[PDB]
């Protein structure tokens, strides 16, 4: 009967709770109660980039820290140079509702996707000097949220049919399907060694996935509503999450529980983006009340505010060398801060 | 130099193309279509036309008096829609289609309309309401085998408004019923009391031709009232 199965599930949950409680001998605030605070952090706006017609949904940097790509709700991708505010490429799409963007780590390809349930891969360096569609990957049964590259031949995608997938490009077929979630999937992030990755998927839960075996190692809970963004700590032993209950949190992979919570009593709106700084000391977040925030990642004390946008903020990124922070909003403007 | 000039030439060409694209984008009107399975939105789509597997969205184009309309319908998706709805916060109109000869699934349609009205990213979008399948309603009321008051008790004390404007040659009972049904939606549409968006109700059937003209007039009104707010003229 189902009763025995439910009882066994309850017993195993109780065991997991006890085994996690057995490993708590300090709180991170106590161990970091003798640390010098960062003080005050001030940043300015160096570039403003104009040319889109509607709201922006995504952006992604390159590995040279100079070129970037943006996707907007009018069927256009634009590649920008951030030193001179020039333009290198503008590409029009077949479908207009786009929700993700990516930039390959070799500078040769780009990718995008949206409500058409198809992942599209575009070639940049061609003999004729044009940009043409080079691959369409189809097979998901719902809208596509995020996608990231691993090389010039493999890609990873997450969609709203409650699944994740790995794709080989030349053949055009899936190679492994990650199943186990309950609701939609909103964000995924890759580890710096390209062996594991993390998914945050809209039922107050996050999962760690092994890419070569194809299964789930461990599952983290604690939030109260949907999870919207996710990213990796630089050394691959922690990660941070943001949700619609106006709260950010920081989790550890070897202690298998939640370590830090960032919140305040004057913020009553959700979070749309999360990213880290190069040394790990700064955590940056974007919110729904038109401004972004800068937190110390060891003391849980707010340290900075960025207040330049007149509408909802949805894209936030930090470079590989750590010189700039780029933000994009629903008023169709990008901004570079240094 | 010797490279900066090529870069600037590329930028200027891209800007010219973007201007040509802006001219086309600014002059096209976009509509989002919603309804349930028993509703008849497929027939409406087919009757505005003469004028690939596992895909996610469908598009229809038509033209009235030299104005261009795009209409978007949602296909292969799941039944949880609290996330993709946000993609549509800048459309000109939502076209909501409801079946009126059911008496059993009317509460669900009412709750759907209530949820659409009060959302946070769609509180500046007007709604056009199409109460469909009038002939079946007429037949089912005249026959006299099913009772409306079983599902809405307040029908037992409703009286026709004294300013009724029915079509000639119609039984009073049909008029009473249809006006009650419409008042059910109109009451929900006026609980906010904000004046930021409007509801336009209509009646329609499966043999009709004048739906394009109705959408035309309603969109004319919407755009006029946005114009008189953008340019500080009230």
């Amino acid at each position: 009967e189902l009763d025995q199965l439910r009882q066994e599930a309850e017993q195993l949950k109780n065991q997991i709770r006890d085994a996690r409680k057995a490993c708590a001998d300090a709180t991170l605030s106590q161990i970091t109660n003798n640390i010098d605070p960062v003080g005050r952090i001030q940043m300015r706006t160096r570039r403003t980039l104009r040319g889109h017609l509607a709201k922006i949904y995504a952006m992604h940097w390159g590995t040279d820290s100079r070129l970037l790509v943006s996707a907007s709700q009018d069927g256009k991708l634009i590649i920008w140079d951030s030193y001179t505010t020039n333009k290198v490429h503008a590409i029009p799409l077949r479908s207009s509702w786009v929700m993700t963007c990516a930039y390959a780590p070799s500078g040769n390809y780009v990718a995008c996707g949206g409500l058409d349930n198809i992942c599209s891969i575009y070639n940049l360096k061609t003999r004729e000097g044009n940009v043409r569609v080079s691959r369409e990957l189809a097979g998901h049964t719902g809208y596509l949220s995020c996608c990231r590259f691993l090389d010039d031949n493999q890609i990873v995608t997450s969609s709203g049919d409650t699944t994740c997938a790995l794709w080989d490009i030349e053949t055009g077929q899936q190679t492994t399907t990650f199943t186990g979630h309950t609701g939609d999937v909103m964000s995924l992030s890759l580890a710096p060694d390209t062996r594991l990755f993390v998914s945050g998927a809209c039922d107050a839960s996050a999962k760690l996935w092994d890419v070569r075996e194809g299964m789930c190692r461990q599952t983290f809970t604690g939030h109260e509503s949907d999870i919207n963004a996710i990213c990796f700590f630089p050394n691959g032993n922690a990660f941070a999450t943001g949700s619609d209950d106006a709260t950010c949190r920081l989790f550890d992979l070897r202690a298998d529980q939640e370590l830090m919570t960032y919140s305040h009593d004057n913020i009553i709106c959700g979070i749309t983006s999360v990213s880290f700084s190069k040394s790990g000391r700064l955590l940056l977040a974007g919110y729904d009340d038109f401004n972004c925030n800068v937190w110390d990642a060891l003391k849980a004390d707010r340290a900075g505010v960025l207040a330049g946008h007149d509408n909802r903020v949805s894209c936030l990124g930090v470079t590989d060398d750590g010189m700039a922070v780029a933000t994009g909003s629903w008023d169709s403007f990008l901004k570079i801060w240094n | 130099s010797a490279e900066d000039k090529a870069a600037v030439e590329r930028s200027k060409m891209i800007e010219k193309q973007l201007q040509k694209d802006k001219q086309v984008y600014r002059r096209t009107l976009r509509l989002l279509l919603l309804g349930a399975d028993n509703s008849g939105k497929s027939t409406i789509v087919k009757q505005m036309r003469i004028y690939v597997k596992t895909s996610g969205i469908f598009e229809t184009k038509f033209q009235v008096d030299k104005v261009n309309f795009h209409m978007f319908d949602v296909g292969a998706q799941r039944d949880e829609r609290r996330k993709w709805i946000q993609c549509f916060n800048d459309v000109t109109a939502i076209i909501f289609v409801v079946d009126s000869s059911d008496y059993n699934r009317l509460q669900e349609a009412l709750n759907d309309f209530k949820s659409i009205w009060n959302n946070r990213w769609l509180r500046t979008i007007s709604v056009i309401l199409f109460l469909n399948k009038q002939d079946l309603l007429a037949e089912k009321v005249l026959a006299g085998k099913s009772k409306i008051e079983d599902y809405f008790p307040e029908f037992a004390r409703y009286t026709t408004p004294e300013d009724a404007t029915p079509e000639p040659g119609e039984d009073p009972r049909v008029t009473r019923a249809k006006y009650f049904i419409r008042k059910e939606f109109v009451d929900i549409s006026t609980a906010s009391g904000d004046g930021r968006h409007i509801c336009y109700p209509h009646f329609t059937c499966s043999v009709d031709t004048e739906n394009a003209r109705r959408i035309f007039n309603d969109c004319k009104d919407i755009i006029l009232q946005m114009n008189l707010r953008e340019y500080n003229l009230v």
Partner: nanobody
Amino acid sequence: QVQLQESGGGLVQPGGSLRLSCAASGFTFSNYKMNWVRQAPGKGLEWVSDISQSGASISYTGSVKGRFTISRDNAKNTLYLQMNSLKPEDTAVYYCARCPAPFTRDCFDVTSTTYAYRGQGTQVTVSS
């Protein structure tokens, strides 16, 4: 870990009365609004009643007016429904529902594809 648990139910004769209780744990109770839904044999998922944060808004369906009552206790973190004057057409499995987001006034919670924030349900049968 969000959890909702129901109590009350069973078999009753027509004209009887019952009390359905719901205990919630894992989130803040004062900032969310609450819903009562049901599912009948051979049918889909229906909607019965809703209640707001403090209690300034209450709403029912047509077939239950004058018979069912709803209540909320925030100190004890509990939701209550009261059933009077039952009919042979009220036999169903009952569920409690929470809205997805705090500080809002919209609901999208009658779906079937494993909505996240919903209990397992309690069975109510009326016969003689």
